[PDB]
UniProtKB/Swiss-Prot annotation, chain C:
Function comment: Subunit of the fusion protein that is processed upon entry into the host cell. Mediates fusion of the virion and cellular membranes by functioning as a class I viral fusion protein. Contains a viral fusion peptide that is unmasked after S2 cleavage. This cleavage can occur at the cell membrane by host TMPRSS2 or during endocytosis by host CSTL. In either case, this triggers an extensive and irreversible conformational change that leads to fusion of the viral envelope with the cellular cytoplasmic membrane, releasing viral genomic RNA into the host cell cytoplasm.
Lineage of the organism: Viruses, Riboviria, Orthornavirae, Pisuviricota, Pisoniviricetes
Recorded consequence of changing residue 30 to F: In strain: Omicron/BA.1
Coiled-coil residue windows: 1-42
Designated name of the protein: Spike protein S2'
Superkingdom of source: Viruses
Amino acid sequence: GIYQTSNFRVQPTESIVRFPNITNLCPFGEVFNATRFASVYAWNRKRISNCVADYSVLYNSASFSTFKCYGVSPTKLNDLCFTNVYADSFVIRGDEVRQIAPGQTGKIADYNYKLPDDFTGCVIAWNSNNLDSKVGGNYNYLYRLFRKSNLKPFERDISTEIYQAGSTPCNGVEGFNCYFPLQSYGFQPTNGVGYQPYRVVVLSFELLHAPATVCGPKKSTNLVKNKCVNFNFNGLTGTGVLTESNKKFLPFQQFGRDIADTTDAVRDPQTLEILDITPCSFGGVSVITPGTNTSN
Amino acid sequence: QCVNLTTRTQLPPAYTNSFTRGVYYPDKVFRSSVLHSTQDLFLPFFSNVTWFHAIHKRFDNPVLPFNDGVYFASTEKSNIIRGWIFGTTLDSKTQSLLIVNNATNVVIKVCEFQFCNDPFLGVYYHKNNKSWMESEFRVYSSANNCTFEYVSQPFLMDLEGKQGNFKNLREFVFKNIDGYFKIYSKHTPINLVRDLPQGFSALEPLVDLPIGINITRFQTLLALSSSGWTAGAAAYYVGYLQPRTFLLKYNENGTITDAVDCALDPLSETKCTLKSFTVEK
Amino acid sequence: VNQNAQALNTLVKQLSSNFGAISSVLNDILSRLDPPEAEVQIDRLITGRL
Ligand SMILES: *[C@@H]1O[C@H](CO)[C@@H](O)[C@H](O)[C@H]1NC(C)=O
């Protein structure tokens, strides 16, 4: 008879990498080595873009008491490319950092800083007792206590409004159970652990859905056509045969997708030209045999 | 500096029909020869668009809301529409965005502005030198703290032109989502008199900005001693976007050529559920 | 003819669903996570496609 057996597949010959022309490094010093951090209820947000980051040196430092990532692995960040990065900086008490992770509730998670449930980023914190806490106590670090209702992720409110925990309305400035919602921490050095002031930085970079700006340090190789190769275009990984195309990408376009959500055209990030992608060959293998009682 | 100009006629609002206008490219992914169903904020077909006009007389620049987007359109000559304010208080306690396509530059600013009641730019008129020259910039008087800023390359636009019927057709779609301000636009010449053109055309994206402000109101800045002036013949139209699924048709060139508004009436809904532009008995 | 074409078409389109994972592309899960966490995601993909 004729029997079907294993399949076959052409194997890739070599690997390609194409990355942008970014040279300048990122302003991490301006974030981690700043003089002054704002209060939790007025956290500060800086936007990082158009540089070449190096997250390894951040991960290899021992200064950090907590370095936890939620949608990526800290090892891989160095070969991923991003569209924009955000840095949120503030200062909190030593034991509330637990509330900052996504999905939990409590004082801070309900009144000061809420993280979405689909968070993709990294949370960093380390205790900075001596640098800012003083025997008199740098009490300008104050947080909110009571609020109208929970605030949605990445919200912020600055106001002098007075709160009425009581039933009756309260006017003027103060009254019976008419509370000024902001309250200052008790930060001073001889205080024990768990009440020390900790500094927190949150990175909330976005993924693989738009023209990217921040890449890691991976250097580009040349371009090879008409051979099964492994390609890596700005973090888009794959395998196939590259070719010169006839599709007329408009200037704002960067990809071309399939019915099954697979890219089948691309634009080279250095020489802006359009390349087709076609997968290598595959097929079955049938063996035709007379009986083994007749011959081998 | 700014003046309260009042000499002009008073009229009630006028309403018109938006046949098949206000469809744009929702993403930056190439697609060709295919029908794709997409959900987003579009301008519904056969909708009621407000109409304002500056003719000879008529000069109305009222505060208009900005809810979940705006489809602005202008049929115009001589480049009279030039500016846009956007803000939530407009009064010195919150930042406001300014876009100005003035004669020399294209300026974009995000500043702690302070405007007044009648902000506007204005060009004098044909004073025997064969040119209209910018002499009026009475928009704002205070600017405290301003984060973003941008001045594009210098240039010179036309400030003259005489014809009874407009040929400049500008469409713009303005969106503000994820703290990002998106501007889509398109230019076209058409032979129209006093209404909105009937036809179909898509809007390629033009700009994104990472601004991050809260906008609830906006106001146009039109091109014009303290009173007495002449209006350029121009009409401009306002409509508002809503969340509504569409079925889009890409041809070989990946060029959007038709759309189906997928809740307009039962026939459109059946076209959606079959994913075709033609249905059989 | 029509019935066969239709069935085959829907089979192909079912490759772009999540089934609850973080992404419908297998190479993004591999190139973003490390093994012990990537397994929990790849497993949902396998169940749905099977
Ligand atoms: C990127 O750098 C290369 C030099 O290695 C240069 O030839 C190319 O033109 C650059 N492309 C862009 C877009 O800057």
